[PDB]
Amino acid sequence: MSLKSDEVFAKIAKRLESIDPANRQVEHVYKFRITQGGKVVKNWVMDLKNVKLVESDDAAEATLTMEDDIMFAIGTGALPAKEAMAQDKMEVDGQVELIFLLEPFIASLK
Template identity: 30%
Template sequence: MDFKNNVGGTGATPALASSSLKSDALFAKIIEEVSKNPAKAKSVNGVFLYNITENGKTVKKWTLDLKSGDVYEGEPKSGKADTTMTVSDADLIDIAAGTTNPQVAFMKGKLKISGNIMLAQKLGPLLKSEAKL
């Protein structure tokens, strides 16, 4: 892909893209669900860092500190994340919507996980269990 010669008005500028990601609504819902059921969130007992990317570059970071029941934008406030996940904004939405299987996304390289991968598996059922379609 040629970023230097990208002429035309089809792409958002990086500053605009980082402030209005589709996944922001997903994290807002996660914040809401964690605040409704903090005991369930704390039962996961892990700190997750999401690196949200666009065009291969990290544009936003979210932390799910499920040891304290806190979800916020940015890096972990103390220490480091138990599990770090790097995924594009669009792929994260597909995973959350159930149109992409997280394991398939991982195998295809769309979802990169470092740290405690087993802990990441505990996160999936927590997030899906409260979803009402």
């Protein structure tokens, strides 16, 4: 069945369809890891080109690792991405700015 974190992926993708082609910001290949408790359970890819979010693992310019519990939390902007990671409760690797671009987009989701 469909889980909570699932809605997140759908939200992000649906949000990408908003960004009009007459004015873009920053699009690139991102990586999303869904760890359950401490170990990975699946891979996720951010198709910023086709404007979709599929499940896959590849060498992306920016790697973002987060647990399911955090998927729905951050995805819905329920908790602060800064504080969340500040407590070493999240592992992300990539250009601060790059990840900072999706920060203001988190709210767009519900």
